[PDB]
Design a protein around this ligand. Structure first.
Ligand SMILES: O=C1COc2ccc(-c3cnc4ccccn34)nc2N1C[C@H]1CCCCCN1
Ligand SMILES: [Cl-]
Length: 321
């Protein structure tokens, strides 16, 4: 069975553009991972430098509902990004199989989604292509957002991608030729996401791009009879045609619907904790693998994304049968 570094490569999860993503297993710890594989020989110098800038963004996104990077392996021809594996797959497929979520379930996921996106907006990182296909689910049904920081050509793509993203989630200012790079475009996409979680369907659709474009620009969508008033009111804060009249995520975190059942636990911007790099239990395990204590401290304190960092972080995740 093919390997790369400390990883046994397993089945392909997806493939498209310049990327493939495979399930794999870290041999030293037994932990499952996902590996994004990019054939560098397909890239020109400009696109190669763009890819490396986007990897450097991935390196600093550390949120429980954002797919985490564990290791970078680079050969002359190929870049490998070893990432968290979300074992329950795409929200897209989950909604197709099971239908709409009850509002209690949708709220749990949406609090995670909003926290993850607001955290990246703090660092002035805009996703620009949030969609059901890159909202993933871990073994406990927690959200893990994929491809935050990456341009479309370095993702395997979703089914309907056109103009570098999924058209049903594209903000109206993109169809009018307007600026397309600030947090407001993600806020629109989040409104489309909330609607799809609670209804099982998209608010704006069409048989072709021209029809969908006109539906998005008109901004009108159906409110299902079963949707609560508070959910409808929350959607009104995302799905606003004029971008500067949209809520910011920090304001939306105070919304009644998003905090229902969380009256003593109001949603607030994520505060990243400092990484404990001194866990002697894991350090002793790694010494047993032949790593030295001094090289563990060097790799973790400089956050190198080498085989030592990956092993330490993976030992901090629960195993799975
Ligand atoms: O296309 C499929 C088919 O179904 C899947 C099932 C599981 C995973 C998966 C699990 N854990 C991770 C970590 C990173 C990336 C993907 N995954 N992916 C997939 N995708 C890839 C996924 C990547 C984001 C861009 C749009 C397409 N979705
Ligand atoms: Cl295996």
């Amino acid at each position: 069975q093919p390997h790369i570094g400390n990883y046994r490569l397993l089945k392909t999860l997806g493939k498209g553009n310049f990327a493939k993503v495979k399930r794999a297993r870290h041999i030293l710890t037994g932990r499952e991972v996902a590996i994004k594989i990019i054939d560098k020989t397909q890239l020109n110098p400009t696109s190669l430098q763009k890819l490396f800038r986007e990897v450097r963004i991935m390196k600093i996104l550390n949120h429980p509902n954002i797919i985490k990077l564990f290791e970078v392996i680079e050969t002359e021809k190929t870049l490998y990004l070893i990432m968290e594996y979300a074992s329950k797959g795409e929200v897209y497929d989950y909604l197709v199989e099971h239908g709409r979520m009850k509002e209690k379930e949708a709220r749990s996921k949406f609090r995670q989604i909003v926290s993850a996106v607001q955290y990246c907006h703090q660092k002035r990182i805009v996703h620009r292509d949030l969609k059901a296909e890159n909202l993933l689910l871990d073994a406990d049904m927690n959200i893990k957002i994929a491809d935050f920081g990456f341009s479309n050509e370095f993702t395997v793509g979703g089914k309907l991608d056109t103009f570098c993203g999924s058209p049903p989630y594209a903000a109206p200012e993109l169809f009018q030729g307007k600026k397309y790079d600030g947090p407001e475009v993600d806020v629109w996409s989040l409104g489309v996401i909330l609607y799809t979680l609670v209804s099982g369907s998209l608010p704006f659709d069409g048989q072709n791009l021209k029809e969908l474009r006109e539906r998005v620009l008109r901004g009108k969508y159906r409110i299902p009879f079963y949707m609560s008033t508070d959910c409808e009111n929350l959607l009104k804060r995302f799905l606003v045609l004029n971008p500067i009249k949209r809520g910011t995520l920090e304001q939306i975190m105070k919304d009644r619907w998003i905090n229902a059942g969380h009256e003593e636990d109001e949603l607030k911007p994520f505060v990243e904790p400092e990484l404990d790099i001194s866990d002697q239990k894991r350090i002793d395990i790694m010494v047993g693998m032949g790593y030295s204590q001094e090289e563990i401290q060097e790799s973790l304190s400089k956050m190198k994304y080498d085989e030592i960092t990956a092993t330490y972080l993976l030992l901090g995740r629960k195993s799975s049968e």
